[PDB]
């Protein structure tokens, strides 16, 4: 602290005492330098002790409003930060088994149930367009989740069976397309 008003008065008082102690004058006129200088150390230290408390209420309001703002913005964005965190960590993981199903899933090829692990349960995945059908179904083997599944039943949106030999480039425009391929793991 410094530039406070009463600091001027206290500074002039102690400068007057500097002058008196350099001159070495009278001691009874020195009763003006401890009956009017000690009046300064209390005309000031009661105005320096009223910005020391304001300067503390400022801090304990600042440090509280800050966290009251954040601690509330944090809770108003969980359903959208959790997802970005999830996919950041997934991309960083780097595993082709997951990258395959994620990419596939981008281009509307999702599964319809939990991918099973047994060497014999079923998997039913959707296939929306032909250019998808080519890259994955070569004959009767299905390449999903970095494995090989033997295709057993294709069935279009008609909910009626489609023959596997009927699916090709030319005759494609006729099938209700989003299909549901069913298969079993190798």
């Amino acid at each position: 602290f410094s530039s406070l008003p009463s600091y001027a008065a206290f500074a002039t008082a102690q400068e007057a005492y500097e002058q008196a102690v350099a001159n070495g004058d009278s001691e009874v006129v020195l009763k003006k330098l401890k009956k009017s200088l000690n009046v300064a150390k209390s005309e000031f230290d009661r105005d320096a002790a009223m910005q020391r408390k304001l300067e503390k209420m400022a801090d304990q309001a600042m440090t509280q409003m800050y966290k009251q703002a954040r601690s509330e913005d944090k809770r108003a964005k969980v359903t959208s930060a959790m997802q970005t965190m999830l996919f950041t960590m997934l991309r960083k993981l780097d595993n082709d088994a997951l990258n395959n199903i994620i990419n596939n899933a981008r281009d509307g090829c999702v599964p319809l149930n939990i991918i099973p692990l047994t060497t014999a349960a079923k998997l039913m995945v959707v296939i929306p367009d032909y250019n998808t059908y080519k890259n994955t179904c070569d004959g009767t083997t299905f390449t999903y989740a970095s494995a090989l599944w033997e295709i057993q039943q294709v069935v279009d949106a008609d909910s009626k069976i489609v023959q596997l030999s009927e699916i090709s480039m030319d005759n494609s425009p006729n099938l209700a397309w989003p299909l549901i391929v069913t298969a079993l793991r190798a």
Binding site: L4, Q51, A69, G108, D129, A157, W177
Partner: protein, 596 residues
């Protein structure tokens, strides 16, 4: 208490309180807005006043930050800072602020009066943020102006619902329509409690006005009816989402063999799905609306929602939907208001119906696959933001024609609004080009399409459906019995009086007039169920009866003439004051005693 600046989207906590909508502004932007405008009030975490008891100085540019509060210079503490200093104002996040130099247009929007064409002309050529700002502030200005109207009280009781009122003298009386409502309060000595809302109707003679009460409180002599105002909610989503293209059809799976009646629309049905949003502009009464349900069944599994700003429009297209689609169809229009009621189909509370029909202000917040907003020539940027906020879908499709009717925009009283500036999507359709074009009449007589295409459009219409029966006797219209600013002329009705029964088979025509009160005069001495030219626009009938007024700038509007004549099947008539429109008119001239 924190947000984003309206111009540069930086962090801030300042609002220019003198502006009606109280928009967030950053430091530099608030300084620029307040150094050049009569707006000099600011509000941060707490209002910026001189916090000395008895002082009321509020101009920010002269206030000073003291101890835990802001102080006048007279009431300044020994230690303090000036708030407005060095081209900025003091708020949160001061040194991380970005200053956009759109303060010119911002001040234009902030201090304008929406009275001359320049205000709307600049409302729809700014950035999207300023676009939404101008939209909500304009609606706010209009509905707060509505407060300056007059008030009415009782005069004497005459029945149970037709009585005599007293408008307060000296201030404008509001128009008399069933959407201008006043809440009624009785003030006995003592006793000033609500008694209900009311909507009125001027009946058969003066000064009597039949009325409709929200509850059967027996009216006495000491009550009054004061107009109840409304509030405005701020917007969030933009007018139109940015476009994305694709290389293959996404989300939608076509068909091959259903109802080729929609034949020429297939290549266009694909182009709809291979984009993010597209527009279809169409001359009056063509493949529009047809196209909507055509694409609807072309993509059978596709969730689709339909919308329009005018009730009669969504209802007429719900009818045209009923004509073709599985039912399996609902029109979630309105639970129990808009007292001119509508459909008779299903539900307003389920939102699993594959086909939902409603009006913009009453949309529920649903997911969809296609949103077919209809007649964009009648909507404003406000409404477009409303739809883009409530719904999200995969594709968007807008259908309309800017050459027809715009939004009324009551307060504008000098200049003209070209369709380019009706809203955002009309601009888009006329600046680069409707990205989808269809133009030849299916509906109304070939000759009248020749008439309309001869005048509003350069001639580019053809169709079928020929004669007969069209007439324009240039009919003198007598006394403009003008109670409200909506015109009334019954000597003109002397022609349906000249043709009451001599039309022995012309029994189900449709009567439309530019003026609402003279149309209630069609509801005064009755000939047939009548409509307005605004409750038309997306509605078609067989034979049409029409009455005008004097050559006011109102009825003389070529666009309302367009949307009045182009809504028939094979017959119409035009009874016009007519200085040169019967020199526009391509029909057979008749006279008043010419009944054969």
């Amino acid at each position: 208490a924190v947000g984003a600046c309206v111009l540069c989207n930086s962090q801030t906590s300042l609002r220019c309180g003198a502006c009606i909508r109280r928009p967030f502004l950053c430091c530099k932007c608030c300084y620029d807005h307040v150094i050049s405008t009569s707006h000099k009030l600011v509000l941060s975490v707490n209002p910026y006043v001189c916090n000395a008891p008895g002082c009321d100085v509020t101009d920010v540019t002269q206030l000073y930050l003291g101890g835990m509060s802001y102080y006048c210079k007279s009431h300044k503490p020994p230690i303090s800072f000036p708030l407005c200093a060095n081209g900025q104002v003091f708020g949160l996040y001061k040194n991380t602020c970005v200053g956009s130099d759109n303060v010119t247009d911002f001040n234009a929007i902030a201090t304008c009066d929406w009275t001359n064409a320049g205000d709307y002309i600049l409302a729809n050529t700014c950035t999207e943020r300023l676009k939404l700002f101008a939209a909500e502030t304009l609606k706010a200005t209009e509905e707060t102006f509505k407060l300056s109207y007059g008030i009415a009280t009782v005069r004497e009781v005459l029945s149970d619902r037709e009585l005599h009122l007293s408008w307060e003298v000296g201030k404008p009386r509001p128009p008399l329509n069933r959407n201008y409502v006043f809440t009624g309060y009785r003030v006995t000595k003592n006793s000033k409690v609500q008694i209900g809302e009311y909507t009125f109707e001027k009946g058969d003679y003066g000064d009597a006005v039949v009325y409709r009460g929200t509850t059967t409180y027996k009216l006495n002599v000491g009550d009054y009816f004061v107009l109840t105002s409304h509030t405005v909610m701020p917007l969030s989503a933009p007018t139109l989402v940015p476009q994305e293209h694709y290389v293959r059809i996404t989300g939608l799976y076509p068909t091959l063999n259903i109802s080729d009646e929609f034949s020429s629309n297939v290549a266009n049905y694909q182009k709809v799905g291979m984009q993010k949003y597209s527009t279809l502009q169409g001359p009056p009464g063509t493949g529009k609306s047809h196209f909507a349900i055509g694409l609807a069944l072309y993509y059978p599994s596709a969730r689709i929602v339909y919308t329009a700003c005018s009730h009669a429009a969504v209802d007429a297209l719900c009818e045209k939907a009923l004509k073709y689609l599985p039912i399996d169809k609902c029109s979630r229009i309105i639970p129990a208001r808009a007292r001119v009621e509508c459909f008779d189909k299903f539900k307003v509370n389920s939102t699993l119906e594959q086909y939902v029909f409603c009006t913009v202000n009453a949309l529920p917040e649903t997911t969809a696959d296609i949103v077919v907003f209809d007649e964009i020539s009648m909507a404003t940027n406000y409404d477009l933001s409303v739809v883009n906020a409530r719904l999200r879908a995969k594709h968007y499709v807008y259908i309309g024609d800017p050459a027809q009717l715009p939004a009324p925009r009551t307060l504008l009283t000098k200049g003209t609004l070209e369709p380019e500036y009706f809203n955002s999507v009309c601009r888009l359709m006329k600046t680069i080009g409707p990205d989808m074009f269809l133009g030849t009449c299916r509906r109304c007589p070939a000759e009248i399409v020749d008439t309309v295409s001869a005048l509003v459009y350069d001639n580019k219409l053809k169709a079928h459906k020929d004669k007969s029966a069209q007439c324009f006797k240039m009919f003198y219209k007598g006394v403009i019995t003008h109670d409200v600013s909506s015109a009334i002329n019954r000597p003109q009705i002397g022609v349906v009086r000249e043709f009451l029964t001599r039309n022995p088979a012309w029994r189900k025509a449709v009567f439309i007039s530019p003026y609402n009160s003279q149309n209630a005069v069609a509801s005064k001495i009755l000939g047939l169920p009548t409509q307005t030219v605004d409750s038309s626009q997306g509605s078609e009938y067989d034979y049409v009866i029409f009455t005008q007024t004097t050559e006011t700038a109102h009825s003389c509007n070529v666009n309302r003439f367009n949307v009045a004549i182009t809504r028939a099947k094979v017959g119409i008539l035009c009874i016009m004051s007519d200085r040169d429109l019967y020199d526009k008119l391509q029909f057979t001239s008749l006279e008043i005693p010419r009944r054969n």
